[PDB]
Design an enzyme around this catalytic site. Structure first.
Site, PDB file in Angstrom:
ATOM      1  N   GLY A 175     103.844  75.461  33.042  1.00 24.08           N
ATOM      2  CA  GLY A 175     105.329  74.905  32.750  1.00 24.08           C
ATOM      3  C   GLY A 175     105.197  75.058  31.265  1.00 24.08           C
ATOM      4  O   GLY A 175     104.326  75.035  30.571  1.00 24.08           O
ATOM      5  N   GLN A 206     108.590  72.481  23.270  1.00 29.81           N
ATOM      6  CA  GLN A 206     107.032  72.953  22.921  1.00 29.81           C
ATOM      7  C   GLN A 206     107.370  74.205  22.365  1.00 29.81           C
ATOM      8  O   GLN A 206     106.127  74.393  21.646  1.00 29.81           O
ATOM      9  CB  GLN A 206     106.469  73.347  24.356  1.00 29.81           C
ATOM     10  CG  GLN A 206     106.019  71.945  25.001  1.00 29.81           C
ATOM     11  CD  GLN A 206     105.432  72.227  26.244  1.00 29.81           C
ATOM     12  OE1 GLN A 206     105.926  72.293  27.193  1.00 29.81           O
ATOM     13  NE2 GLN A 206     104.131  72.341  26.034  1.00 29.81           N
ATOM     14  N   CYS A 258      98.224  70.310  29.399  1.00 26.35           N
ATOM     15  CA  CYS A 258      99.556  70.717  28.443  1.00 26.35           C
ATOM     16  C   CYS A 258      99.205  71.711  27.403  1.00 26.35           C
ATOM     17  O   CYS A 258      98.250  71.618  26.713  1.00 26.35           O
ATOM     18  CB  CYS A 258     100.140  69.682  27.793  1.00 26.35           C
ATOM     19  SG  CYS A 258     101.582  69.644  26.780  1.00 26.35           S
ATOM     20  N   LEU A 259     100.146  72.944  27.497  1.00 27.05           N
ATOM     21  CA  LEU A 259      99.992  73.953  26.402  1.00 27.05           C
ATOM     22  C   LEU A 259     100.249  73.321  25.045  1.00 27.05           C
ATOM     23  O   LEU A 259      99.487  73.631  24.080  1.00 27.05           O
ATOM     24  CB  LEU A 259     100.982  74.874  26.510  1.00 27.05           C
ATOM     25  CG  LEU A 259     100.696  75.972  27.642  1.00 27.05           C
ATOM     26  CD1 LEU A 259     101.800  76.887  27.962  1.00 27.05           C
ATOM     27  CD2 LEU A 259      99.329  76.726  27.284  1.00 27.05           C
ATOM     28  N   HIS A 311     106.295  66.006  34.403  1.00 24.28           N
ATOM     29  CA  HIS A 311     105.397  66.186  33.004  1.00 24.28           C
ATOM     30  C   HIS A 311     106.515  67.039  32.106  1.00 24.28           C
ATOM     31  O   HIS A 311     106.685  66.555  30.949  1.00 24.28           O
ATOM     32  CB  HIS A 311     104.179  67.276  33.569  1.00 24.28           C
ATOM     33  CG  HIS A 311     103.596  67.580  32.049  1.00 24.28           C
ATOM     34  ND1 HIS A 311     102.350  67.130  32.134  1.00 24.28           N
ATOM     35  CD2 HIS A 311     103.875  68.488  31.281  1.00 24.28           C
ATOM     36  CE1 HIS A 311     101.952  67.804  30.852  1.00 24.28           C
ATOM     37  NE2 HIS A 311     103.020  68.584  30.424  1.00 24.28           N
ATOM     38  N   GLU A 312     107.184  68.057  32.640  1.00 27.27           N
ATOM     39  CA  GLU A 312     108.124  68.667  31.925  1.00 27.27           C
ATOM     40  C   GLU A 312     109.562  67.898  31.518  1.00 27.27           C
ATOM     41  O   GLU A 312     109.798  68.218  30.018  1.00 27.27           O
ATOM     42  CB  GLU A 312     108.509  70.275  32.607  1.00 27.27           C
ATOM     43  CG  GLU A 312     107.319  71.109  32.882  1.00 27.27           C
ATOM     44  CD  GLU A 312     106.426  71.440  31.557  1.00 27.27           C
ATOM     45  OE1 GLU A 312     107.075  71.417  30.483  1.00 27.27           O
ATOM     46  OE2 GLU A 312     105.270  71.501  31.829  1.00 27.27           O
ATOM     47  N   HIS A 333     108.532  65.725  28.366  1.00 18.86           N
ATOM     48  CA  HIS A 333     108.999  66.530  27.285  1.00 18.86           C
ATOM     49  C   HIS A 333     110.377  66.548  26.400  1.00 18.86           C
ATOM     50  O   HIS A 333     110.371  66.515  25.244  1.00 18.86           O
ATOM     51  CB  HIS A 333     108.465  68.191  27.441  1.00 18.86           C
ATOM     52  CG  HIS A 333     106.953  68.216  27.232  1.00 18.86           C
ATOM     53  ND1 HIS A 333     106.101  68.028  26.237  1.00 18.86           N
ATOM     54  CD2 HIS A 333     106.167  68.928  28.034  1.00 18.86           C
ATOM     55  CE1 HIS A 333     105.148  68.471  26.422  1.00 18.86           C
ATOM     56  NE2 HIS A 333     104.623  69.125  27.690  1.00 18.86           N
TER      57      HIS A 333
HETATM   58  O1  LIG Z   1     100.806  74.841  31.708  1.00 19.30           O
HETATM   59  C1  LIG Z   1     100.164  73.804  31.526  1.00 19.30           C
HETATM   60  C2  LIG Z   1      99.224  73.896  30.476  1.00 19.30           C
HETATM   61  C3  LIG Z   1      98.173  74.971  30.493  1.00 19.30           C
HETATM   62  C4  LIG Z   1      97.213  74.881  29.475  1.00 19.30           C
HETATM   63  C5  LIG Z   1      96.727  76.453  28.941  1.00 19.30           C
HETATM   64  C6  LIG Z   1      95.657  76.408  28.017  1.00 19.30           C
HETATM   65  C7  LIG Z   1      94.891  75.376  27.704  1.00 19.30           C
HETATM   66  O2  LIG Z   1      94.112  75.526  26.711  1.00 19.30           O
HETATM   67  C8  LIG Z   1      95.352  74.151  28.083  1.00 19.30           C
HETATM   68  O3  LIG Z   1      94.543  72.813  27.851  1.00 19.30           O
HETATM   69  C9  LIG Z   1      96.250  73.921  29.164  1.00 19.30           C
HETATM   70  O4  LIG Z   1     100.759  72.576  31.826  1.00 19.30           O
HETATM   71  C10 LIG Z   1     101.876  72.330  32.306  1.00 19.30           C
HETATM   72  C11 LIG Z   1     102.287  71.158  32.799  1.00 19.30           C
HETATM   73  C12 LIG Z   1     101.326  70.711  34.061  1.00 19.30           C
HETATM   74  C13 LIG Z   1     100.078  69.979  33.934  1.00 19.30           C
HETATM   75  C14 LIG Z   1      99.391  69.859  34.979  1.00 19.30           C
HETATM   76  C15 LIG Z   1      99.914  69.811  35.984  1.00 19.30           C
HETATM   77  C16 LIG Z   1     101.185  70.503  36.203  1.00 19.30           C
HETATM   78  C17 LIG Z   1     101.892  70.713  35.249  1.00 19.30           C
HETATM   79 CO   LIG Z   2     103.265  69.753  28.537  1.00 21.69          CO
END
Ligand SMILES: O=C(/C=C/c1ccc(O)c(O)c1)OCCc1ccccc1
Ligand SMILES: [Co+2]
Length: 163
Positions: free
Chosen positions: A45, A50, A95-96, A137-138, A141
């Site tokens: 996501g 972001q 989260c990215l 979550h998104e 943001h």
């Molecule tokens: O794409 C992500 C985050 C990815 C990511 C990549 C590299 C990392 O080093 C990190 O720590 C995280 O999160 C998106 C949101 C989300 C989170 C949980 C469940 C559903 C949706």
């Molecule tokens: Co996020």
């Protein structure tokens, strides 16, 4: 093009994003760059803030069964609003914008949203499970909210410890 991802604790992530009113080539370029950026960093996501763009748009692309993200499965969610929310569940999130940290957040177990796609077409979408979590979550943001804001007493200290 690859875009820079903004990380906590940047105050940019506290921005309230603005409604999109022009669904034009520039919008499409930005969405394409968001997708490229999300995939290169192994995310599922990404919200526009972001990458520093304060617009109410986000993309979600969940992996299929062989753990592969197919582009045709990508949702481009613009100007979203909740119609319905229901239930509660704990879900472990990352989260990215907060790389390397994962923790359980309480979310609605089911949501229904209305939004527009990149062609300004109005959609209604019902979601549960991972998709519902990703949507919540998104959308958070877009309102300047990060998942770490939602942690319990116990969990923020673990977050600050890991910091
Ligand atoms: O794409 C992500 C985050 C990815 C990511 C990549 C590299 C990392 O080093 C990190 O720590 C995280 O999160 C998106 C949101 C989300 C989170 C949980 C469940 C559903 C949706
Ligand atoms: Co996020």
């Amino acid at each position: 093009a690859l875009l820079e991802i903004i990380h906590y604790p940047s105050k940019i992530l506290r921005t309230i994003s603005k409604e999109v009113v022009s669904f034009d080539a520039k919008l499409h370029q930005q969405l394409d760059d968001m997708y490229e950026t999300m995939i290169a960093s192994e995310g599922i996501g990404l919200a526009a803030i972001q990458v520093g763009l304060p617009l109410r748009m986000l993309i979600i692309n969940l992996p299929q069964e062989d753990g592969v993200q197919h582009k045709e499965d990508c949702l481009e969610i613009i100007n979203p609003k909740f119609i319905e929310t229901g239930g509660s569940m704990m879900y472990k999130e990352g989260c990215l914008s907060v790389p390397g940290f994962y923790e359980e957040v309480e979310r609605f177990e089911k949501v229904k949203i209305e939004y527009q796609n990149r062609f300004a077409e109005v959609k209604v979408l019902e979601a549960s499970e991972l998709l519902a979590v990703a949507i919540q979550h998104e959308i958070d943001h877009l309102n300047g909210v990060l998942f770490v804001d939602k942690l319990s007493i116990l969990k923020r200290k673990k977050f600050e410890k890991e910091l």
